[PDB]
Design a protein around this ligand. Structure first.
Ligand SMILES: [Ca+2]
Ligand SMILES: [Ca+2]
Ligand SMILES: [Ca+2]
Ligand SMILES: [Ca+2]
Ligand SMILES: [Ca+2]
Ligand SMILES: [Ca+2]
Ligand SMILES: [Ca+2]
Ligand SMILES: [Ca+2]
Lengths: 464, 464, 464, 464
């Protein structure tokens, strides 16, 4: 009824199996049950399934108990029933589409749907299409797990999908995802279709050359009001990509060796104090249909980008003549004309549907320049002070953030120096002087308007 | 019905006043209304109230519109009707008790109760007892405000109090508190009595010599499952104090010039990657009645403490012979025997109710050593390598974290060097060698057991 | 009514005959009656029956009273009505099958069925097919008898057979079989189809060249929870063979001149302190469908085997290239592919039904290596001490038993030296040193895991 | 419902305790439940109870899980609630009586009453009065446990007591007691008041100087039809004592350093092939009221006795002028006149109740010489052969067993040489010659009559 020992790694409905334990817990939906998976035989430890597990329908804890003793995971492996090679193993909702960058809820290892308060600890969710599907499911806890080699939807997919494809705002919330290793998953983790107020923190999102399609470490696709804090993202096309999700607080993450560190859209998203380095582009902000979306950047250390890392599975930058740097507007993705890379397994997008970024203000049938076309400030040396000039809307507040680099040739933002607040006059101009806190080589600055839209960096100002 | 301009700083119910606008919005509880407060007259700008505003009962946005133009706040000031000197201005639920370190919901400036989706922007909530009371109220947004000189309950109090004093878990949730300056409030911000899944981020919590009773920057008192990220905490008795709240994720905060940086209790709380420096004690972990509480510390930079900062308004360290350092167990607070400082305005605690921390095996009538008495590891220099010895329970996982200091005399944790995972044998011993990543002066380490309990730091090892 | 004298060795229903006495006792099922068979004429003494006796249906004692005076038996001889030569005299349940190694309850001398508390003493149950059939019959006593030349089912068959062929667990129990000579019976004694908690002790089970089919001294075929103690077993194919009976305690028996001493399967069976010598194989442990069966050996003296004794009537070892020794896994029997010998009189097994023992871990359609593939330990000389290495599962108890031989070339287990208890670490390794108790020539050891599975013997270590 | 983890060594009714688990299992009497006791803290491991556990009322397995990993026991300790020193801690049914040698069912650690199929594994049942009470309870399994320091009834007491003190024959049966260490228990194990068909095997029954009253390793007191095989008995007053229990098969046990090895009464008991050495008396056979009781000895190796080991807690031999040796008739115990030692804690026997052994054949008011006064045979050297003369009843079978000693002065039975069968003539005489199998120093012999009564040993015959 309440504790179920799993002392056999066979996949059948007889006492001792993981399947059995789940079927037992499911017959007591009211009871909070602990499913305790023992170590059996010798490392490595794996339950190789022969069919999909039944969906989880009780507030259970599935604990790989070996982690408590040696830090080793107990795998739950779908490779026996999920045949195929790479992303071809994972059909989408349309069966001619396959992989991770297509609508799909296919072939999950563990399904948390219409249920709450599930804990997963000590497991390796290995070689499914979706590792863990969390759908209309809240107050769950996923920590001290490995999530590996899931080549379909995502390693962990939190989606508020109502069934019909519409988002829900109050169903897939308040989940925690802590201290997990996400390795070689097409998309590491998805927050999508209304999933909100979730905490994703202190995880390692890593891809290697083994990954069939290295796409997004985290993809936020119409997911909202989440917190993404203190994670590391390596070797993906985009470390984190937002597709029209809103009001997510993304802070103190490290994004490195991706094509793009942060691939951004969506009104109200904030990147705060992240370390973004060793990418082709640090932060990209794309044009989108919502011309009132403001994407905020504050205190981010963004440096040592412009690396030749062209990796473009439904994101990233592979356009050869693409403008590189710390923060770059109007970078194209899957939905944009000019984009170079895969748009998804077995997908053809119609050139008639590919969106264009407006190059003149009155232009029609295009997405506005993002962040309402806000312009980087101008820096000039002025008798040992740094003089900043802001060009924006009239009678408005602007937050000027200053950054330094120890390399005098660098034109990015290696160290954060501090900020000031300025008010434009009736022509939209504001000037101000600012003494450096330290003695430094080059200085950049950007601005954030009253709605939270942040500009690109100014040209570097070289001192001496 | 939907937009209400406030063009008069008088406090009356006639068209144009803040009071009027709120009364109007309250008569349309279904309608989301914007209350837009204009600049009137000359800076500084203040609406000096003559009585409590009516409680907010509609999903409104109260915007100080001057912030959008020059970054200046429009104050809402209770000093006309909240007379008294210091904390004596603010009676508690018991009227002979006063101030911030007592049960109180008295004399708030704005009451958000039994209502959701309220936004406050551009305001200075000045000289009330509680600045903003959020009580059984969810999905609110408090940003770009100043919260000043509130000497009662807290600058912002999020409490699930049911009225009788019992917590509620589903009423006071999913709130955001972002980019605010909290200055000279007795308690900067409270998360209490069940308030959960809130995000408190990128705020400055500061106290000056003007503060009548400088207590806790943030106090978590039976508040749970919250995220506290990227804030700065200066000059309080405790930067952040937890009193028996559970499972809060506290990360990437700076705690400086407090008596205690983090004053901790409560099962499942995690301090991750915080900067804790210039305090008497960096992190204190108190004994408590729940002997199964595990408090986790991981990757925290804790250094330059042991300062002579004795400031003890319901927390802090003022005990003269108190052991100082980075991480210290069994520090007393208000509920503990041996404590030195105020236990609250007009409160006498009975010496019969003051709790003691057990010093001896088999001792009775006391709280166990916290974190289940976990012991710091032993470091020894060993053929150019650093040898660690772990002493814990048998056949268990332990996470050894290594820290370095560039000062060879420092015995704390200035820079985080990395971690290894070890398994104890049948006597509860594990050894491991570990080469420093860099060439450094002194090295410390701690351990975290399988339940998330983290030890104090080892003795420093000087390399020479 | 209560005592019936048998003073005539004719077989008829008139007063004085054995038949008469049994018919009389049967008409008083409530009365415990003594049937006292006198000596009549001169030795040898025999009642030569002309038809089957009626089945026994009262709690009688059938006493051959001559044993009380001179130790001579009074025979009950079926050779007049059981014609045929050898095993061909004894059809099975299927009449085209014949002999002892087939399902059969045919042609018994005395039938103890649906009755309890029968004593047989002082008799020679001679030349029937089954000597004494005990079937759904309990609390009986069989001692000081001879059981001879029964070439069908068994000399004594205790079976819980319900009639249809299914076992019963509570019907054929608590019987005792003590101080009898079982000579030249195909199967000496059977414990089968649920018969449990019986005591078989201090009997001599012997076969000579007269025996048509010398099979199993004792066969346990789905018999459980019995005790088999202090018997001698000579000249059979298997001294004692278990076929999937469970939890029998087999101890302090002598097995000699058999092809196999103990031919073992069945979860929970324990061989304790037996003397097993002068056989082709001492103890064989077969593969079986129950992959969780653990067969335990402890303190057995097993030596002087590897004899050229190929005798394989439904057991034994006749495979020419068969690995020989003290304890050998995966030896084939009747149900196994590769087996060499009779599979039963008039039985053809289908090559499609013959079971194979898996030779690789992932192999399909085969029985696992028995005792879960437990491996013999490794012995090495180590500064005059004996160093043992165990390779097993991680964090487990193993019981290492040491044995010596006075012949330095012997690789078996002549004398039992003592045991130690070791705990494997996280790689499944344990080492231990052990000084011999005596000064001896060669040393072997085995291991028993926590589930009671015992390994084969290690390579011999010669001390020099 | 089915598996209950015990992860806390506190004694209370809250989740995790042993008490809790038992209360839970008791509410599902139909469910077979596993109670799994974890290792908690550091070795040694003990649950110190504060009150009696509730009686066990479900077919549970109580497993100390640590044994599976390192061979260590988890103790269940009654010393907190069972105060007193030594046997004085344990009142009997009469409260002025105390200890182990009195009617008592007081203060058990685990009560198995009116319930079946209980397994105990991996535990140390420490410092109760009765360790485990098995009373009207069957098909239980007790293995791999320690049973220590129980100074009342017995370490393990199997009794068919109906409550009033009357035996039951069908209630306390088919239990197994295997591979346990019984240490410093007053009475190691009891089979009493009708308990039958139990198997007690491969246990170590040991007493040290710590034992307050070292009485009987095993006491059989009106227990019947049991098997006691392959155990070791050291340092008690009697290794094994039978008090009027019947038809027990006691075989292949080692009895050493006791005052008496086997202290015997009771019709139908058989001692077969035991090793009895280093005691004051090897085997004692007492007089008793049942003058038809026959006690059998066959193939026992009994030598090196006559040691000065006077230890007489309700058995043993302490009479100073007592006849010593291998097999001795008419040794007194508790119920006999002439006895020297304790007759039980706080027991006074009335000299009017003390039984006397008849010294003349038709003497009145006394117990007959045991084994019907059977006389040892007479041996004489006869031209290199050994001539035996038997003096017994007329026209009877006698089984002559021959024994040798390698010491020519020894008059006991060190090695078993073989047996012959003789028939007395009308004067009760039988003579026979017998060549020794080996060349040996001295030879003894005894006889066993047709009813199973065995004599003492003859005078030794010295061969030269
Ligand atoms: Ca994607
Ligand atoms: Ca995806
Ligand atoms: Ca406070
Ligand atoms: Ca307060
Ligand atoms: Ca057979
Ligand atoms: Ca047979
Ligand atoms: Ca006793
Ligand atoms: Ca007793």
């Amino acid at each position: 009824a309440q504790t179920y020992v799993v002392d056999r790694y066979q996949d059948d409905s007889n006492k001792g199996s993981l399947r059995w334990a789940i079927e037992q817990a499911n017959a007591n939906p009211g009871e909070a049950s602990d499913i305790l998976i023992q170590a059996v035989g010798k490392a490595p430890y794996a339950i190789k399934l022969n069919s999909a597990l039944p969906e989880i329908k009780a507030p259970v804890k599935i604990i790989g108990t070996q982690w408590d003793k040696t830090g080793e995971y107990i795998a739950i492996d779908g490779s026996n029933y999920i045949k195929g090679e790479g992303a071809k193993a994972c059909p989408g909702a349309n069966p001619e589409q396959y992989g991770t960058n297509v609508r799909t809820m296919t072939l999950p290892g563990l399904v948390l749907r219409d249920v709450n308060n599930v804990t997963l600890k000590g497991l390796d969710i290995h070689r499914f299409c979706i590792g863990v599907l969390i759908n209309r499911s809240s107050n769950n806890l996923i920590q001290h797990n490995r999530i590996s080699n899931n080549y379909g939807g995502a390693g962990v997919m939190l989606t508020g999908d109502d069934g019909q494809g519409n988002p829900t705002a109050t169903t897939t919330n308040n989940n925690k995802v802590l201290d997990n290793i996400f390795q070689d998953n097409g998309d590491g983790l998805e927050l999508t279709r209304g999933a909100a107020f979730n905490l994703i923190a202190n995880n390692h999102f890593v891809s290697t050359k083994a990954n069939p399609e290295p796409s997004q470490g985290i993809e936020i696709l119409w997911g909202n009001d989440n917190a993404v804090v203190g994670n590391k993202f390596e070797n993906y096309s985009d470390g984190l990509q937002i597709n029209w999700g809103k009001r997510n607080y993304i802070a103190y993450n490290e994004m490195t060796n991706n094509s793009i560190g942060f691939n951004m859209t969506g009104d109200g998203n904030i990147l705060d104090s992240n370390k973004v380095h060793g990418n082709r582009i640090g932060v990209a902000i794309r044009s989108e249909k919502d011309a009132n979306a403001k994407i905020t950047l504050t205190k981010n250390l963004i440096w040592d980008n412009g690396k030749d890392i062209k990796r473009c599975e439904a994101g990233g930058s592979c356009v050869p003549d693409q403008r590189l740097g710390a923060i770059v507007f109007a970078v194209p993705a899957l939905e944009h004309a000019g984009f170079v890379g895969s748009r998804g397994g077995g997908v053809i997008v119609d050139p008639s549907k590919q969106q264009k970024t407006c190059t003149q203000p009155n232009e029609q049938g295009c997405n506005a320049q993002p962040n309402q076309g806000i312009k980087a400030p101008k820096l000039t040396a002025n008798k040992g002070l740094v003089a900043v000039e802001v060009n924006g809307l009239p009678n408005q507040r602007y937050q000027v953030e200053f950054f330094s680099n120890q390399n005098a040739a660098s034109k990015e933002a290696e160290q954060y120096l501090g900020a000031i607040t300025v008010a434009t006059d009736a022509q939209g101009i504001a000037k101000a002087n600012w003494k450096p806190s330290v003695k430094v080589a080059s200085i950049t600055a950007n601005i954030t308007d009253r709605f939270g839209a942040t500009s690109e960096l100014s040209s570097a100002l070289q001192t001496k």
